[PDB]
């Protein structure tokens, strides 16, 4: 047989969103003595009073925090035998293509982690292909929700688009009857533009998920509830410990078909303006993130009512709706059609927090092990060798260890054309 | 369209022309320094015997230390026509910014892996120096290439040995995550952002790995005309300047200092810009670098086109197959000697059945005794005692380990002597001289020599940038191949030796005595030696 070891490559994988995502790396004795998780405080907000008497009126003080963890590693644990010849090339192969799945593995849970805890929620009656300048009209959707919420976007914004509706838009251009320099661009290339409705970067990615239609229906609130920002609680023990602040567990009248990334919005409730506290016109929407039991969810954006009578004046100064659930208030379901997502945020809402694994240690004798720095994204992890005389064999393993997390669930976005019927 | 795209291009087009050349230069540098042994699945798998019985290192060895006794550098003497002295302040820049440590260590390295896999290189930079600058609060130092077979990717279309008609070249810097950090800070770039570039390296024989951060310099080279002002220079003669190095700094200011312009001329020149580039993205475009040539000197040691494909080679290409035979067969021969029964008798059991103390090795008998008879079969039947073969080196393992090493011994011969390789690194010094004249003229303050001293002329702009004005009379000198000294006075000494060697006991005699000791070094008892010398020298005219 005649044979040349000249590869023939078939894959180009790109790292948008895990490049974006800014890397955390939390000193490692402090996270291996206290679980792996470590808290941030949240921006402070103040409650405002008018009046000149104010005897026994004066508030506290609250303040809010949120806690980023990791998972668990992932490997490419696989053995080293004799079996053929190539095995030594296919070896260095190997490491190379373990290397970059690892990378794609990451862009996919960054990706995952957005869709899904993506609190704000864009749907569109058509798609994208059908009147003209509606990609322009989504993406200005988006920036028009971040910016009447009043949310920070200091650091940046971006808006990922998935490939189909990215030919859409480019689609859009280039049938314009008229060329000038977008035009042009958009029929050279396929770029719509760097910028477009006020985002500073919009891309397209090829790994963003797609939402599936969710059949549930006919479901209401179960008792009126009422969510209080809180920064720590006791337990049973008189311990005070920590309370994250973007999770509300709800009682709904039945869970059945609800899942992790469902996107819901209460009949009734109306955003606010988080500084200003005005109501919008636009209703609020959450993202469910937890189904337990099975008339109780959890939803990202807690829901602190701004006519709570209940709440103290700290925690009302908290307030991004303007109203509470009702013991009936139906349960909209915003996500009636599958659809591949369109994924907007501003760029501190996620981030990868990132811990080492010392297997360079002396207590790990007879393993050879190294960093292995990952390109694309910005991650390291370790490569440890072990070779096993016994069935004269030998295993070998890259190991990266990382968890996403969403500080800002608010700030992270969804964008779902054609939520027809 | 994309300048990206273009560069990639360039060099993808020359990482494909020079994939054979590298890969055997890189075969060549791993068989003359880690392991004769170029292989994985064997020694991985069923472990054998697998020795290293060197017989061409001592032959690299030899020829590391015949190049290393005779040292080259750059030597610069001047034009026809010119001043007799013109090249002297060059020499002086270029003898102070050459005598560190690490210019030695990078012609060294150079030179070893010129011997040993067929091509090295080197890099001229310019650095800022506060304490002790060369000219100019600027320093040019040498800087070493590793591997420059891999990591030096030279412009696919150029046929001469120096490189002197390279377009482009983009070197391949892999470091550790320390020393990316250490290179984000000194050039501005993004720390956070990791970068990537095709790795230069290979790691097979796996090694374990290498932990590495790539990134790549693509320098080109663009010959243009542009402008240059002709003034006239308020103390005597017309000087030439080009518009570019002057363009705000103190186009103005030399009005003001008191030159006139009088005409105004378009030159073509050569300009070098230098770009850091990932496999992804640019990160600095194309940052103007001083001088007309790229600064890798690239040095060989067979080199040549066969069919518009370059080959270079060493020592070492043409002795790897007889080398490796022999290895084969040394590892044979010792396992012959270990796996092998050795020379003891075949018995019968019933032989020696009740006797089986006396063959066991002890002496504490006088004789061997046997066993006779057996009952069923009368006696034991007779044939003479039997021995295991003593193991034996095969007549073809005991020749061919012969021929191998005959054969090796004689294609491990560079030339008769190591003047072609001593040759072609002098090309590589002259072409190191013309680089360094380039950035010199660039970048130092070189006074001009007038019979009516040493002037030089030079402004300050608004900003305190002090901006240097190189009149067009650089090109003074050209350059040859001398030896090697550290200073312009161990250079005079030399000079003067040489000629008292063939001056007869004459006056000259006389005069160059007296000239060495006013050039000697200073203690007491030699400070009054040559105190005494410049008396005589002063009184006799």
């Not at chain 1, 509606?134 to 914004?157: H, P, Q, Y």
């Not at chain 1, 397209?204 to 006919?218: C, D, H, N, Y």
């Not at chain 2, 518009?308 to 080679?313: A, C, I, L, P």
């Not at chain 2, 000629?499 to 005069?511: R, V």
């Amino acid at each position: 047989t005649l044979a040349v070891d000249e590869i023939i490559e078939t894959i180009s994988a790109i790292t948008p969103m895990a490049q974006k995502a800014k890397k955390y790396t939390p000193p490692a004795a402090s996270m291996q003595r206290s679980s792996n998780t470590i808290w941030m405080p949240v921006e402070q907000e103040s409650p405002t009073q008018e009046g000149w008497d104010l005897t026994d009126k004066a508030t506290g003080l609250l303040e809010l925090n949120v806690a980023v963890n990791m998972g668990e590693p992932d490997n490419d644990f696989f053995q080293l035998r004799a079996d053929d010849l190539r095995d030594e090339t296919a070896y260095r192969r190997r490491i190379q293509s373990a290397a970059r799945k690892l990378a794609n593995n990451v862009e996919l849970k960054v990706a995952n982690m957005a869709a899904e805890m993506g609190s704000l929620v864009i749907t569109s009656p058509d798609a994208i292909g059908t009147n003209t300048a509606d990609a322009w009209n989504f993406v200005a959707d988006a920036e028009e929700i971040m910016f009447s919420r009043e949310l920070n976007r200091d650091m940046g914004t971006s808006y990922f688009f998935n490939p189909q509706d990215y030919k859409k838009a480019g689609y859009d251009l280039t049938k314009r009857d008229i060329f000038g320099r977008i035009p042009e661009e958009a029929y050279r290339d396929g770029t719509i533009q760097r910028q477009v409705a006020g985002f500073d970067d919009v891309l397209r990615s090829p790994k963003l998920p797609v939402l599936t239609k969710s059949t549930a229906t006919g479901i209401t609130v179960s008792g009126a509830q009422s969510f209080k920002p809180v920064a720590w609680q006791l337990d049973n023990d008189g311990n005070k410990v920590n309370v994250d602040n973007r999770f509300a567990t709800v009682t709904l009248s039945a869970t059945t078909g609800m899942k992790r990334g469902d996107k819901i919005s209460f009949a009734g409730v109306k955003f606010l303006g988080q500084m200003a506290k005005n109501v919008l016109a636009q209703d609020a929407t959450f993202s469910v993130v937890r189904v337990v039991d099975g008339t109780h969810v959890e939803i990202t954006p807690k829901p602190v009512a701004l006519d709570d009578v209940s709440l103290s004046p700290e925690q009302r100064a908290y307030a991004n709706v303007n109203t509470s659930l009702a013991d009936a208030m139906a349960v909209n379901i915003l996500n009636v059609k599958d659809a591949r997502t369109n994924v907007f945020w501003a760029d501190d809402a996620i981030r990868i927090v990132s811990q080492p694994i010392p297997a360079n240690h002396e207590l790990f004798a007879g393993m050879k092990t190294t960093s292995f720095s990952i390109p694309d994204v910005g991650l390291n992890g370790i490569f440890a060798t072990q070779g096993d005389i016994s069935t004269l064999s030998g295993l070998c393993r890259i190991a990266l260890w990382y968890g996403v997390n969403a500080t800002r669930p608010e700030a992270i976005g969804v964008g779902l054309p054609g939520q027809t019927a | 369209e994309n300048r990206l795209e273009s560069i990639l291009s360039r060099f993808d087009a020359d990482w494909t022309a020079s994939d054979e050349a590298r890969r055997e230069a890189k075969n060549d540098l791993f068989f003359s320094r880690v392991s004769q042994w170029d292989d994985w699945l064997s020694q991985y798998t069923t472990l054998q015997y697998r020795g290293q019985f060197d017989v061409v290192r001592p032959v690299v060895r030899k020829l590391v230390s015949e190049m290393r006794q005779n040292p080259i550098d750059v030597l610069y003497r001047p034009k026809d026509g010119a001043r007799p002295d013109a090249a002297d302040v060059l020499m002086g820049m270029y003898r102070t910014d050459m005598r560190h440590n690490t210019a030695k260590i990078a012609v060294n390295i150079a030179v070893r892996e010129q011997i040993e896999a067929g091509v090295g290189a080197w890099r001229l930079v310019t650095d800022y120096e506060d304490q002790s600058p060369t000219s100019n609060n600027q320093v040019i130092r040498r800087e070493p290439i590793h591997s420059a077979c891999s990591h030096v990717i030279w412009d696919s279309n150029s046929k001469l040995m120096d490189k002197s008609d390279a377009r482009h070249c983009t070197v391949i810097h892999s470091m550790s995550q320390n020393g990316w950090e250490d290179f984000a800070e000194k050039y501005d770039l993004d720390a956070d952002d990791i970068p990537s570039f095709q790795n230069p390296n290979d790691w097979v024989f796996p090694w374990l790995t290498q932990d590495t951060i790539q990134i790549a310099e693509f320098y080109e080279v663009v010959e243009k005309k542009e402008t240059a002002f002709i003034y006239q220079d308020p103390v005597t003669g017309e000087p030439v300047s080009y518009f570019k190095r002057d363009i705000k700094d103190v186009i103005d200011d030399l009005a003001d200092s008191g030159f006139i312009k009088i005409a105004e001329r378009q030159i073509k020149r050569r300009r070098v810009y230098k770009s850091i580039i990932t496999c992804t993205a640019v990160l600095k475009d194309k940052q103007l670098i001083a001088g007309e040539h790229i600064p890798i000197v690239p040095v060989f040691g067979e080199w040549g086109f066969v069919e518009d494909k370059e080959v270079y080679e060493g020592v070492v290409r043409l002795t790897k197959d007889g080398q490796r035979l022999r290895n084969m067969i040394m590892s044979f021969n010792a396992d012959i000697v270990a796996r092998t029964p050795k020379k003891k008798p075949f018995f019968w059991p019933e032989q020696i059945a009740g006797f089986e103390h006396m063959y066991d090795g002890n002496d504490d008998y006088p004789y061997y005794l046997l066993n006779r008879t057996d009952e069923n079969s009368g006696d034991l039947p007779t044939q003479p005692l039997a021995y295991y073969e003593n193991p034996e080196v095969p007549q073809a393992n005991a020749y061919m380990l012969e021929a191998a090493t005959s054969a090796v011994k004689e294609v491990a011969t560079l030339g008769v002597e190591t003047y072609v390789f001593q040759d072609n690194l002098a090309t590589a010094m002259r072409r190191d001289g013309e680089i360094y004249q380039s950035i010199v003229n660039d970048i130092y303050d070189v006074p001009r020599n007038v019979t009516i001293l040493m002037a030089e002329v030079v402004d300050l702009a608004t900003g305190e940038k002090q901006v240097l004005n190189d009149i067009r009379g650089r090109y003074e000198c050209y350059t040859d191949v001398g030896p090697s000294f550290q200073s312009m006075k161990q250079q005079n000494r030399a000079e003067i030796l040489e000629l008292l060697g063939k001056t007869p006991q004459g006056t000259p005699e006389y005069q160059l005595l007296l000239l060495q000791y006013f050039t000697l070094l200073d203690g007491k008892g030699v400070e009054m030696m040559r105190d005494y010398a410049n008396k005589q020298l002063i009184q006799m005219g």
